[PDB]
């Protein structure tokens, strides 16, 4: 899939913006879900509004033709929904449209074909009913992990685009629950909490990487996924965060070598909820949220702008594997 290196650099770009936004808190997000939502939205935009979005997702538009971007997403999404038998992985997209809104037919055709979007009509005027239809859809897609996503919803909303993934993978070799023991986790130099620390003696793809000043551990899932964990040496977290690139990840993923190691990894459950406007603005995605946004590819009835772009993601790690689910909620109003 040819949009991959673009998505990997978009992950590191967005990560760095979120870390600079709040540098001492948990971070968890889905680069693929956000890139899917905004690439789908770009089908309804024109001119610089459009180009800012795809460039912000790290596409060069004078290098990759736009048809190939969208077909790249179309295939990505199809692969995501056809995992190996041992991995649970799904994704979907719902486009909740104001009842009565006259759309540009080509938009509705393109989101259905390229992004597999399920279109629904709703009355944003009945705020409790519209919130329930969106939140039920997200709760179903995320298999119960993101509940009551939308709490407040503008009566003048023209559309809400909602994109999710569901992930549940099993470690290729699970931890034994009997071996999990409470240990100290050093949040910072003056703060220690207790955590259930899982452990196993195993053959791991594990190395200490000079360029990152970090241990680098690959944890294979059964089926078509791997988790890569980076443990920075003392004082080196910011350095590690700055120095990750797609070429570095690729080199780690391509190496087959394993060595005997005693791994201790915490069981955990974390969540991120993010307003993406400012961070995506730092990535250059600005006009689509503004009083100049050109969403005339969506509707020619009246100008729009994107009012809201929120991302929520949940992660659970335990002895069996990992479960994770993001959702994007991108809402447009008349401008």
């Amino acid at each position: 899939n040819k949009i991959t290196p673009n998505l990997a650099e978009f992950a590191f770009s967005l990560y760095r913006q979120l870390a600079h936004q709040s540098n001492s808190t948990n971070i968890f997000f889905s680069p693929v879900s956000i890139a899917t939502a905004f690439a789908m939205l770009s089908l309804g935009t024109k001119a610089d509004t459009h180009d800012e979005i795809l460039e912000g997702l790290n596409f060069n538009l004078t290098e990759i033709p736009e048809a190939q971007i969208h077909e790249g997403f179309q295939e990505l999404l199809r692969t995501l929904n056809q995992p190996d038998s041992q991995l649970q992985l799904t994704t979907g997209n719902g486009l909740f449209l104001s009842e009565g809104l006259k759309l540009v037919d080509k938009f509705l055709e393109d989101v259905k074909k390229l992004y597999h979007s399920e279109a629904f009509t709703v009355n944003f005027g009945d705020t409790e009913e519209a919130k329930k239809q969106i939140n039920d859809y997200v709760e179903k897609g995320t298999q119960g992990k993101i509940v009551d996503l939308v709490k407040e919803l503008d009566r003048d909303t023209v559309f809400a685009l909602v994109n999710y993934i569901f992930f549940k993978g099993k470690w290729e070799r699970p931890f034994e629950v009997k071996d999990t023991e409470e240990e100290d986790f050093h949040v910072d130099q003056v703060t220690t909490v207790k955590v259930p620390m899982m452990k196993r003696l195993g053959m791991f793809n594990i190395q200490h990487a000079k360029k990152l000043s970090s241990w680098v551990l690959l944890m294979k899932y059964l089926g078509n996924a791997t988790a890569i964990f980076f443990l920075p040496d003392e004082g080196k977290l910011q350095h590690l965060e700055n120095e990750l690139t797609h070429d570095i990840i690729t080199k780690f993923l391509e190496n087959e070598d394993r060595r005997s190691a005693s791994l201790h990894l915490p069981k955990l459950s974390i969540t991120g909820t993010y307003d993406l406007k400012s961070v995506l603005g730092q990535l250059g995605i600005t006009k689509v949220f503004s009083n100049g946004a050109d969403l005339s590819g969506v509707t020619e009835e009246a100008p729009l702008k994107l009012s809201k772009a929120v991302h929520k993601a949940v992660l659970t790690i335990d002895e069996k594997g990992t479960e994770a689910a993001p959702d994007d909620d991108d809402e447009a109003i008349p401008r």
């Binding site: 899939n1 991959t4 998505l7 992950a11 967005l14 990560y15 870390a19 001492s24 808190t25 948990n26 971070i27 968890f28 997000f29 889905s30 680069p31 693929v32 990505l76 692969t79 995501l80 992985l89 992930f167 986790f185 050093h186 949040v187 909490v193 955590v195 259930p196 620390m197 594990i206 241990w215 551990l217 078509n224 996924a225 791997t226 988790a227 890569i228 964990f229 980076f230 443990l231 920075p232 977290l237 590690l240 965060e241 990750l244 990840i249 690729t250 993923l253 060595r259 005997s260 190691a261 005693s262 201790h264 915490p266 955990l268 459950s269 974390i270 993601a313 990992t322 994770a324 993001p326």
Partner: protein, 35 residues
Amino acid sequence: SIPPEVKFNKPFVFLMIEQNTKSPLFMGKVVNPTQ
């Protein structure tokens, strides 16, 4: 050789990669491991 011990008991970064596409499905950093 004595097997190394690698213990995730301080902040760490991670990424989850889908194997067919190599796409980054998730990225994060754990600073405080909630339960």
